[PDB]
Amino acid sequence: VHLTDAEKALVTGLWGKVKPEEIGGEALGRLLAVYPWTQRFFDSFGDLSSASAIMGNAKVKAHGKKVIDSFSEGLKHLDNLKGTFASLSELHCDKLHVDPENFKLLGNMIVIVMAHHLGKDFTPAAQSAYQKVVSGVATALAHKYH
Amino acid sequence: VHLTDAEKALVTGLWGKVKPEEIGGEALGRLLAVYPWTQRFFDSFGDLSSASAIMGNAKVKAHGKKVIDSFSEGLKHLDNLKGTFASLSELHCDKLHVDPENFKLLGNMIVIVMAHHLGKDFTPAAQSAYQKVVSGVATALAHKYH
Amino acid sequence: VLSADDKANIKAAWGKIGGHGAEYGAEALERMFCSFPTTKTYFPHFDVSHGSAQVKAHGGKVADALATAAGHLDDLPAALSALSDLHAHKLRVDPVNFKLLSHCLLVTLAAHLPSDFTPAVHASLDKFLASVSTVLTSKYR
Amino acid sequence: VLSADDKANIKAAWGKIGGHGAEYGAEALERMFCSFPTTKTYFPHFDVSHGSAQVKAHGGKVADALATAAGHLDDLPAALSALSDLHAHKLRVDPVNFKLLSHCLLVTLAAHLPSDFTPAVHASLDKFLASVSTVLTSKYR
Numbered sequence A, B: 001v002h003l004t005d006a007e008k009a010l011v012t013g014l015w016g017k018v019k020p021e022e023i024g025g026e027a028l029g030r031l032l033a034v035y036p037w038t039q040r041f042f043d044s045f046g047d048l049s050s051a052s053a054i055m056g057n058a059k060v061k062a063h064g065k066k067v068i069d070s071f072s073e074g075l076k077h078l079d080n081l082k083g084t085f086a087s088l089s090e091l092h093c094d095k096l097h098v099d100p101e102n103f104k105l106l107g108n109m110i111v112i113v114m115a116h117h118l119g120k121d122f123t124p125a126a127q128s129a130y131q132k133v134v135s136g137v138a139t140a141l142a143h144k145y146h
Numbered sequence C, D: 001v002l003s004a005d006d007k008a009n010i011k012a013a014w015g016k017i018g019g020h021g022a023e024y025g026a027e028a029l030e031r032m033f034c035s036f037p038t039t040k041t042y043f044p045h046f047d048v049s050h051g052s053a054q055v056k057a058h059g060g061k062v063a064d065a066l067a068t069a070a071g072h073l074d075d076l077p078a079a080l081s082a083l084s085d086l087h088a089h090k091l092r093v094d095p096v097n098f099k100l101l102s103h104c105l106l107v108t109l110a111a112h113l114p115s116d117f118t119p120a121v122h123a124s125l126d127k128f129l130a131s132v133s134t135v136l137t138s139k140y141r
């Protein structure tokens, strides 16, 4: 949502320094391992019975890529995350029944995974910009909940 | 935010059946008693050392009225809670440093106080409409946080 | 932890509930489904219309568990151990939902017991339900 | 509760932190102030600029408390009892802020210990910090 032009540059600059597929696979996998109730939604994914199984699971990795490709498209529309995620908001609410609190948790995993990959380059200022982004994505995903 | 015209009527109808000053004094007082860390913001209010002291405190009751008068004005602008609470969002963030999670907690107290006063008239459908209202007020109050 | 006064308030409140436990549990559930529709998928076989039989029966199970807990304020982890396994390992209930049901039970009690639901009693009951929810979510690991 | 594997992961991780505890605590605090500016008012005397001395000193106090806790995984309420009084009764810290600082410490560890911060270790450390925060917020009453 409201990031300055400079803040947007900070975000998009660092995004070009990571490999999105890795960020997505690892963020989703950490979500499943750190908050195991989230596994309730992924019964079709097969073996999620340990962190090793989760990180070795092809379906988790593939789904992580779809999640992160949608995140990447969000980064190109920071001034309209509500519009950008409207269809996905409907999907998560009407079809999947995911409580919106979990959007915040996955956002937090994306933040932690970015720090894991970027190290000291993920400064306190960079983290603050990314928290604003994931907060906005979570708000947008929760918008069509009814 | 998005309430149908009928949902708005349900909300405003029941609002005309309570005494706002009572709702405000009691919601704020319950906030202070149920979640005591919130008292960190009200050192100037004097004795908040027990539920009895809180409910007997003139400043709490007076402040409860200001809070509820702002809530009442929000009920007249349900299609623009963001604009309606923009100045108060700035106040709570920049001057008061209240974490936005607490807006949700006070909203919950307003809901419980409405049930306390209205009894069976506060139906599951009425509660759902009011949850949408307080969720929207909390979102609006958090909007200008930076 | 729960103070002596908390325990007094919880005992007093649950005495006032008495035979209406199942009614209030059913209503708490109905309120949760209405305000927070995501919760309905935990009970796919339920008719969740006002006054339905399966809702009333399940409300009774919840009420029974809470009554037993109210007589076990000093050993909740032991008393709620079997239910903690069921909700975490089997049902995999999202922890947010315990907060949702607790809020709806408090709404239900306020709506039914206005003379008894004082601010002090409300504060004690909020702690009681939060303590119960804590045990019920303790075992994701 | 913390499993045997959790305890193993927490011990391994804190061994890897070793002498850098104060640095990481200071950074966790800086990250919290930057991402969540509401938290700054808890420390009105602080210069919160990058590398400030009071932040480093307080980071060291937090690090010391966490190191002691990591050697007390089976008696956290007893070990953190004095700090629970300070944070609830005196500082009246909003419980949300413990989640904020815990997240920032995890960010800090991921940024500094990439080889060691595996998903399994992350899950264990999240439980450790949540367990510590629980004790620190246990005493509002």
Ligand code: HEM
Pocket: A038, A041, A042, A044, A063, A066, A067, A068, A070, A071, A088, A091, A092, A096, A098, A102, A103, A106, A107, A137, A141
């Ligand atoms: C940053 C937050 C999130 C984003 C951007 C996101 C994005 C997506 C996308 C792009 C899809 C694919 C839809 C399609 O291909 O048609 C999807 C599906 C799905 N999402 Fe999410 N999601 C998020 C959070 C969550 C969370 C927190 C959960 C559960 C805890 C969740 C559960 C699911 C499930 C179960 C599916 C269906 C997967 C399948 O059947 O293949 N999502 N999401």
Ligand code: HEM
Pocket: B038, B041, B042, B044, B063, B066, B067, B068, B070, B071, B088, B091, B092, B096, B098, B102, B103, B106, B107, B137, B141
């Ligand atoms: C529904 C949510 C809320 C509404 C509608 C609201 C509204 C208001 C209003 C109208 C004022 C008066 C400003 C003025 O007179 O210039 C105010 C001040 C204040 N608010 Fe809130 N507020 C809400 C939530 C909270 C929460 C959750 C807290 C703290 C936990 C809080 C703490 C304060 C404080 C400390 C003041 C200054 C009081 C004084 O010095 O007299 N507010 N708020």
Ligand code: HEM
Pocket: C039, C042, C043, C058, C061, C062, C065, C066, C083, C087, C091, C093, C097, C098, C099, C101, C132, C133, C136
């Ligand atoms: C105060 C908190 C709670 C208490 C005391 C409680 C108690 C119980 C009890 C005693 C049972 C056993 C039912 C039986 O044997 O027939 C049960 C089952 C169940 N609970 Fe809970 N529960 C609580 C919170 C929740 C929440 C928040 C959810 C989900 C939103 C939930 C979902 C379920 C489901 C899906 C079942 C299985 C129902 C069936 O198969 O008939 N519970 N609960």
Ligand code: HEM
Pocket: D039, D042, D043, D058, D061, D062, D065, D066, D083, D087, D091, D093, D097, D098, D099, D101, D132, D133, D136
């Ligand atoms: C892992 C969680 C935490 C730990 C282990 C911890 C530990 C400590 C310790 C050991 C002290 C004593 C400092 C001294 O004696 O000089 C302290 C003080 C303090 N803590 Fe915490 N704390 C935690 C979370 C928080 C949070 C989330 C906040 C607020 C956002 C906070 C605010 C404060 C403040 C304001 C002081 C007094 C500082 C001073 O006067 O120098 N703490 N903490």
